[PDB]
Design a protein around this ligand. Structure first.
Ligand SMILES: CC(=O)N[C@@H]1[C@@H](O)[C@H](O[C@@H]2O[C@H](CO[C@]3(C(=O)O)C[C@H](O)[C@@H](NC(C)=O)[C@H]([C@H](O)[C@H](O)CO)O3)[C@H](O)[C@H](O)[C@H]2O)[C@@H](CO)O[C@H]1O
Ligand SMILES: CC(=O)N[C@@H]1[C@@H](O)[C@H](O[C@@H]2O[C@H](CO[C@]3(C(=O)O)C[C@H](O)[C@@H](NC(C)=O)[C@H]([C@H](O)[C@H](O)CO)O3)[C@H](O)[C@H](O)[C@H]2O)[C@@H](CO)O[C@H]1O
Ligand SMILES: CC(=O)N[C@@H]1[C@@H](O)[C@H](O[C@@H]2O[C@H](CO[C@]3(C(=O)O)C[C@H](O)[C@@H](NC(C)=O)[C@H]([C@H](O)[C@H](O)CO)O3)[C@H](O)[C@H](O)[C@H]2O)[C@@H](CO)O[C@H]1O
Ligand SMILES: *[C@@H]1O[C@H](CO)[C@@H](O[C@@H]2O[C@H](CO)[C@@H](O[C@H]3O[C@H](CO)[C@@H](O)[C@H](O)[C@@H]3O)[C@H](O)[C@H]2NC(C)=O)[C@H](O)[C@H]1NC(C)=O
Ligand SMILES: *[C@@H]1O[C@H](CO)[C@@H](O[C@@H]2O[C@H](CO)[C@@H](O[C@H]3O[C@H](CO)[C@@H](O)[C@H](O)[C@@H]3O)[C@H](O)[C@H]2NC(C)=O)[C@H](O)[C@H]1NC(C)=O
Ligand SMILES: *[C@@H]1O[C@H](CO)[C@@H](O[C@@H]2O[C@H](CO)[C@@H](O[C@H]3O[C@H](CO)[C@@H](O)[C@H](O)[C@@H]3O)[C@H](O)[C@H]2NC(C)=O)[C@H](O)[C@H]1NC(C)=O
Ligand SMILES: *[C@@H]1O[C@H](CO)[C@@H](O[C@@H]2O[C@H](CO)[C@@H](O)[C@H](O)[C@H]2NC(C)=O)[C@H](O)[C@H]1NC(C)=O
Ligand SMILES: *[C@@H]1O[C@H](CO)[C@@H](O[C@@H]2O[C@H](CO)[C@@H](O)[C@H](O)[C@H]2NC(C)=O)[C@H](O)[C@H]1NC(C)=O
Ligand SMILES: *[C@@H]1O[C@H](CO)[C@@H](O[C@@H]2O[C@H](CO)[C@@H](O)[C@H](O)[C@H]2NC(C)=O)[C@H](O)[C@H]1NC(C)=O
Ligand SMILES: *[C@@H]1O[C@H](CO)[C@@H](O)[C@H](O)[C@H]1NC(C)=O
Ligand SMILES: *[C@@H]1O[C@H](CO)[C@@H](O)[C@H](O)[C@H]1NC(C)=O
Ligand SMILES: *[C@@H]1O[C@H](CO)[C@@H](O)[C@H](O)[C@H]1NC(C)=O
Ligand SMILES: *[C@@H]1O[C@H](CO)[C@@H](O)[C@H](O)[C@H]1NC(C)=O
Ligand SMILES: *[C@@H]1O[C@H](CO)[C@@H](O)[C@H](O)[C@H]1NC(C)=O
Ligand SMILES: *[C@@H]1O[C@H](CO)[C@@H](O)[C@H](O)[C@H]1NC(C)=O
Ligand SMILES: *[C@@H]1O[C@H](CO)[C@@H](O)[C@H](O)[C@H]1NC(C)=O
Ligand SMILES: *[C@@H]1O[C@H](CO)[C@@H](O)[C@H](O)[C@H]1NC(C)=O
Ligand SMILES: *[C@@H]1O[C@H](CO)[C@@H](O)[C@H](O)[C@H]1NC(C)=O
Ligand SMILES: *[C@H]1O[C@H](CO)[C@@H](O)[C@H](O)[C@H]1NC(C)=O
Ligand SMILES: *[C@H]1O[C@H](CO)[C@@H](O)[C@H](O)[C@H]1NC(C)=O
Ligand SMILES: *[C@H]1O[C@H](CO)[C@@H](O)[C@H](O)[C@H]1NC(C)=O
Lengths: 491, 491, 491
């Protein structure tokens, strides 16, 4: 009736989602996406990393050559998987600093072994035991050589092996601790004496200690395992009068991205970049709360089990019912755009989406999605994070380092999502406000702001006229005389 | 005189406080609150954590059973407090890896001890010394058993103790290092020989070393202390020909939240969640600069001694004196609200608070207070952070881990408070701006913006009229003819 | 022609720089500055820290007194620089826990040595070797004393040295491991026996181990090095029957800010606070990607090789050509200010800078520069971050601690710069918007907003009139009758 109404508005949905911003602990938005990965398939995917399933073998048993581990000879891995069911089935042994030898072999990622011809003239080689059976016969660790007397003589060993290669050699060797004096004499022909293994740059001396230990596979003796790395140009010197469990050669030691993980998860024929002890997990999300132990391109571990990133504007119910604009009011019936126009004129009541504002909001949200989704970084060999034995100081430090790290990342995650969500609310609010301001400016003196996100346009404004406003081609001069007469009439 | 003035404004206070934002290193606000706890009472509150005051006893002395520590037998703790005055008063001893045994016992949180009947047939038990008096008589550590020859014989000990319990057993034992060959023979009847303590899964051999050490309580000998954990189903085997300081049984070893702290603070009858070596501290604040060593639900340690969180808007002096609005001007006389209205009309000059805007600002500030205040998290046994001896590598790492952690938290604290304060300034500024905009919209063509946060209303607007604007019931149509004539008159 | 145009605008430059904000991965601004230091001179500046260039000597060789290191006696340092070319040229030795002794001496920062008169009655002193020549003669480590038999007797040593000083004493000593039984007898007159060095609070026993090691400088024997710290009031007791490499006195041990660094960078005559192995670097910037190893007041190490901080507003091309304001349009021709006014009136078309808005933007940007530039903090002795040997557990932890730290700082840097740049864009946009709003308010009913950042002023407004608007002295009442007639005329 000589005027029209033009309202600016934004969509709303019936099923919104609650997120956290800096301004609000809980604010409902039109949509959100989860940034914490909280589930796994439960299987370790055999691709794209080279998996070695230890089965009944620990890495150290596979290294020494426990008979059940013969199948592992010379294999490589990106990730060696050690099973809780694993058990030793050879001569009872220990490794002082077991954790370090495990770690250095794990990180090297290879069991490649090269035999060498040591001169063991004057002694008997290849000692075996019923505690270490291979194909039902008494045997021993494959990579070790139990030397004993020859004709009740054990002449002092003073044996050399030069490293004339261009790579390092890793030697694994041991000392036999007999149960009794009787065993000492029966095995080596004389009283126990120390073993010294040296190079130009290092030395280790180990004393065999006679005594009963609790029987394991009916063996009260023990073997203690040691290692030596020999550089190119250096020489291994082995010096012993008995009790030597000698090396048969060396392991290659390599550097790269290999590691070891304790897990009982089955190995699957599938492809996944991120491995945890619970199974492989997708790495689309920036964070995860599945396990602090990871290998590969993995989301960062956080304490939160959910963090929702807003991917839409504030969700505002439509006030119940004159058309009305965005002031405390969303439009559930606007389904082809995020922002738009509703009008009332001579020809009826209509709605149209505004593409520009809708696309600007969507583009920006997609931009932050692109920064946060599918952008994980790889980590490989790290520190251990679960422990089967009590140890004190070093373990306290390992645990505190990891606890510290997780709390700092959990804090970063919490802040990041609150900041991002505040920014999303601000940028989506801003597109609405800019649309309203642009429209106000077009209309000049031909309309007044009704306070509800709508303009009273003080002239006849048919469908084409409204279209000209929406398209940005409205010429205010054309209508100004009509509008001014209508606005500043005296009633 | 045919018009009225309506000004929008906000309060101001005579005693504002300076805070930091992202925009300003120093900006005065109406009020702030401190987020760094910087004082302690100076006492350790005995509630709600179970405190054990070591008095003259270290934990290790209480474990071994130094006579002055007999009162500690079998006690438990959440926090064992070790005093600087503590001193040993029994046989001179050392503990290789003292720090680890201290740590593992501290974390276990119990001195529960179960006696066992070891078969020491063939030797004399219960050796004592004048260096370790109990009730004025020569004595020894309560939990240890100094075995010596019987009739100048010391038959080889080969003694067993199975763990048929469903929990782990912690055994503490030792080796006696005699001052001279004469002592060796007088005590054990033969030359010194090694001690081996083993289980199915582990072994330790220790060599007694004869020699003079500086006398302590007139004793040139030493005892060295060792420990062994025996799992259920396993067996302790002790094998010795002399110099054995034997266990009398085992300690329970538990897991939980127990720890140990070095402090000289007195223990008080009071209740506080957070304990530091300086005393308990309140844990209302998110940060603290009292001590990096903490136990319980504690604020996080930061380097800053103060961080002030704004709890009010910018504080702006009232310009000296026509009423005027918020543009570069606060209202010290507005004491019943944070924002409001001042008017001049036919009936005088008045002021009224706006509840809605005031409450919206207060609610939001209370929200951020609720997130930051009284929300501390608990930590228990951690790593040591002060050291009485120089050690090198491990200590360097312990110190660097803690330094690293504190710098990262101090950074987080600094950023958090700057961000929060910027947000507080922004949300309080926003309530002022929204109040002004809402008012502008009500007034439509009946008023003009005077540029100083006030409107010139171009009609007679009595107290009820002004009230209708403040209440949001003003009907612009009622006054529009009058206002338009007044606005667009030609003078 | 009875009207004027007044446009508000901001500068633009032909050569802008791309930065990252929270809103945009790439946004062009007028200027930026680099926050990551990525180059070094390549030399270590000898000022202001006290540098000690080890040349051919490691710290440990300088400590023991290898002949080529005699020049180092008693010197101090802030930073000891160890060269890759360094080599030992004396008796072949090792140090169990070499890394710790290196670290504790490095951190102490002094080689100050005080000779003491030990009573070595009954033995020969000052043993020497061809493996350790000094001025072409057979010699030995300067700070050690190789004792051997006197007249084929080596009476048991039981020797004391009290610490009656008020500072700690650091004693360095050793054990000689002879190649053969023949050497043992030729040197010490009897079979090898253990060495015990003790105090009231500590003890160490070391066993000499006879055996061939690979010859070095024709020596198949080895010396193993040990250390003891003796507190004031305590006593050093040395107890040996042979194989003792005795101390000649003690080192002072101090506490302070000293460290050690591995580098081949030459030492220069220059002054720089921050030292890295690549050379000294400037410390103006808050971050650096030169080296994770640093000493002194240094930028923090990050993974990024560049982080650009915006130091100007968004850079917006001038739309091609009616004068026009800031809406999607910057002014390349405005060179004497950041914001300003362009006008068209009766007297022509002019431009003027607005000082207030320009200065407010510049001041704020300078403020954030002042917070970020030249504000680095000092760190001194830390942990090692590069390793020449494989070690396992401890090294894994050292590496993980540093990796963890760097990732957290790299994250903080990335967020900080994105946040700061967003704030810079917001504050510079805000000065433009405030200038426009201030102008709008002055003009009252005398102008209309043309939508392009300009006002149509509906009255004759000559150069003085425009000046009154720019100066904030424009009196709208003077022109209102003229303007209203022009605005609300009917055409
Ligand atoms: C050298 C020798 O033959 N010694 C005999 C002892 O082995 C034997 O004590 C019994 O030993 C039993 C285990 O027998 C082996 C084994 O481990 O299988 C037989 C091995 O050939 C022998 N290995 C070598 C390289 O000689 C090995 C070794 O002696 C022990 O493992 C060392 O602990 O023993 C089993 O443990 C019985 O319980 C045990 O009594 C005694 C008595 O028969 O005679 C010795 O001559
Ligand atoms: C076995 C014995 O009686 N040995 C005598 C030596 O103790 C003694 O040397 C003197 O020893 C003095 C301390 O006497 C005790 C003690 O610690 O109180 C007496 C204890 O009963 C004895 N403990 C046991 C279990 O036999 C203990 C032990 O021998 C030492 O502590 C080992 O160091 O000694 C005190 O230290 C005197 O300064 C010291 O001369 C000599 C000489 O009298 O005779 C030995 O038979
Ligand atoms: C005590 C003595 O003189 N022993 C003689 C052996 O040294 C010698 O074996 C030869 O030793 C050669 C090195 O000679 C020195 C040295 O290091 O320069 C000479 C030193 O004076 C002696 N040091 C002391 C304090 O006595 C030192 C020491 O014996 C060795 O370093 C211990 O390893 O030896 C060189 O190594 C030759 O290759 C080696 O054969 C034998 C045979 O000549 O006679 C011993 O009496
Ligand atoms: C030191 O004490 C040890 C524990 O008491 C003891 O070990 C025990 O030795 C017996 C036999 O002497 C073993 O008994 C075994 O006997 C049958 C054959 O009759 C075997 O088939 C079984 O394996 C059976 O167990 C015990 O197993 C063994 N116990 C432990 C815990 O090791 C040592 O022999 C004693 N040492 C000396 C030198 O006397
Ligand atoms: C190795 O040298 C040691 C230090 O010189 C020496 O220890 C000293 O021994 C004397 C006695 O021989 C102690 O003197 C004590 O004598 C009176 C009784 O007359 C006691 O009441 C006092 O305790 C007094 O101190 C020294 O205390 C002691 N010094 C130290 C530092 O331990 C060893 O005895 C020597 N060892 C051998 C085997 O000869
Ligand atoms: C244990 O075996 C060792 C390695 O086979 C052996 O060491 C070698 O000893 C020879 C001499 O016996 C040294 O040869 C040196 O001889 C000339 C003089 O003719 C010297 O000028 C040279 O230095 C030359 O090298 C070897 O250097 C040495 N090799 C190594 C690697 O140390 C030990 O001697 C044997 N030990 C015993 C006790 O027999
Ligand atoms: C290292 O090897 C040497 C021989 O090269 C051993 O020395 C011999 O030991 C025997 C037995 O004790 C003696 O009877 C010989 O006289 C020694 N030979 C020489 C040349 O001295 C030595 O025992 C071995 N070392 C170890 C620790 O086993
Ligand atoms: C561990 O106990 C065994 C006995 O079970 C000890 O062996 C005896 O030692 C004595 C003294 O040296 C010898 O005379 C006996 O002949 C040994 N008995 C047997 C059966 O061999 C052994 O010495 C003890 N071990 C330690 C380290 O003390
Ligand atoms: C520490 O010094 C003592 C002497 O104070 C040494 O004891 C003597 O050792 C010799 C050689 O073995 C014996 O013949 C004497 O009888 C011992 N004297 C006494 C009083 O017992 C002892 O050997 C030295 N200890 C070490 C580890 O070298
Ligand atoms: C909600 O957001 C995510 C991320 O943009 C998108 O993949 C998903 O399809 C959206 N859901 C709906 C119903 O729009
Ligand atoms: C592992 O050991 C179990 C239990 O002894 C056995 O049944 C199984 O077949 C073994 N698996 C392999 C792959 O050797
Ligand atoms: C993964 O395994 C850990 C350790 O057993 C367990 O605490 C956690 O609940 C598991 N997470 C999932 C998603 O299975
Ligand atoms: C200032 O702020 C704190 C926190 O809101 C409040 O407890 C305190 O009472 C306030 N002081 C005044 C005078 O309003
Ligand atoms: C602790 O020792 C001191 C000094 O010897 C003594 O005076 C005090 O009574 C002792 N306190 C306790 C509780 O035993
Ligand atoms: C707490 O104790 C530490 C260490 O003695 C001291 O540096 C610090 O100043 C103390 N703080 C307070 C608030 O007493
Ligand atoms: C750009 O910014 C930096 C930091 O403010 C300043 O030092 C430099 O001179 C500026 N360059 C120009 C051309 O304005
Ligand atoms: C260091 O050793 C090299 C190589 O032997 C020698 O040429 C050089 O002169 C030595 N430098 C010093 C400062 O002693
Ligand atoms: C500094 O040295 C390290 C280690 O050699 C090297 O990786 C890095 O590229 C160097 N940086 C510069 C700027 O020279
Ligand atoms: C072990 O060594 C012997 C040398 O006696 C050699 O012939 C063979 O390779 C090995 N024999 C067995 C049975 O493993
Ligand atoms: C020590 O052991 C003996 C065994 O001889 C036992 O009777 C008693 O429990 C203890 N005696 C003393 C005095 O502590
Ligand atoms: C080594 O000690 C002797 C004692 O025999 C002393 O005279 C001199 O200071 C030293 N002699 C040499 C040659 O270094």
């Amino acid at each position: 009736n000589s005027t029209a109404t033009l309202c600016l508005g934004h969509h709303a949905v019936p099923n919104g989602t609650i997120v956290k911003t800096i301004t609000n602990d809980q604010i409902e938005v039109t949509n959100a996406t989860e940034l914490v990965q909280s589930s796994s398939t439960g299987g370790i995917c055999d691709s794209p990393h080279q998996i070695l399933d230890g089965e009944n073998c620990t890495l150290i048993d596979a290294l020494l050559g426990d008979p059940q581990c013969d199948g592992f000879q010379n294999k490589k891995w990106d990730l060696f998987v050690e099973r809780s069911k694993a058990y030793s089935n050879c001569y009872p042994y220990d490794v002082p600093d077991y954790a370090s030898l495990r770690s250095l072999v794990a990180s090297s990622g290879t069991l490649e072994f090269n035999n060498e011809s040591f001169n063991w003239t004057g002694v008997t080689q290849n000692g075996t035991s019923s505690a270490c059976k291979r194909r039902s016969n008494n045997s021993f660790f494959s990579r070790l050589n139990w030397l004993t007397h020859l004709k009740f003589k054990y002449p002092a060993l003073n044996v050399t092996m030069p490293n004339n290669e261009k790579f390092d050699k890793l030697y694994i060797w041991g000392v036999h601790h007999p149960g009794t004096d009787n065993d000492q004499i029966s095995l080596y022909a004389q009283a126990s004496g120390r073993i010294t293994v040296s190079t130009k740059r290092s030395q280790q001396t180990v004393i065999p200690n006679i005594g009963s230990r609790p029987r394991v596979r009916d063996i009260p003796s023990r073997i203690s395992i040691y290692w030596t790395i020999v550089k190119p140009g250096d020489i291994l010197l082995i010096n012993s009068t008995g009790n030597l469990i000698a090396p048969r050669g060396y392991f290659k030691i390599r550097s790269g991205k290999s590691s070891i993980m304790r897990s009982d998860a089955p190995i699957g024929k599938c492809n996944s970049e991120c491995i945890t002890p619970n199974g492989s997990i997708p790495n689309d999300k920036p964070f995860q709360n599945v396990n602090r132990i990871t290998y590969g391109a993995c989301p960062r571990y956080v304490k939160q089990n959910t963090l929702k990133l807003a991917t839409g504007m504030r969700n505002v119910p439509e006030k119940q019912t004159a058309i009305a604009g965005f002031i405390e009011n969303g439009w559930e019936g606007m389904v082809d755009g995020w922002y738009g126009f509703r009008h009332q004129n001579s020809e009826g009541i209509g709605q149209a989406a505004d593409l520009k504002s809708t696309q600007a909001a969507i583009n920006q949200i997609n931009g932050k999605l692109n920064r946060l989704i599918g952008k994980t970084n790889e980590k490989f060999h790290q520190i251990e994070k679960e422990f089967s034995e009590v140890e004190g100081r070093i373990q306290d430090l390992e645990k505190y380092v990891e606890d510290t790290k997780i709390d700092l990342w959990s804090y970063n995650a919490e802040l990041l999502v609150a900041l991002e969500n505040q920014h999303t609310i601000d940028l989506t609010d801003s597109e609405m406000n800019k649309l309203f301001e642009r429209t106000k400016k077009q209309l000049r003196e031909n309309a007044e702001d009704m306070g509800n996100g709508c303009f009273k346009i003080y002239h006849k404004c048919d469908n084409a006229c409204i279209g000209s406003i929406r398209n940005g081609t409205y010429d205010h001069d054309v209508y100004r005389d009509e509008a001014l007469n209508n606005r500043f009439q005296i009633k």
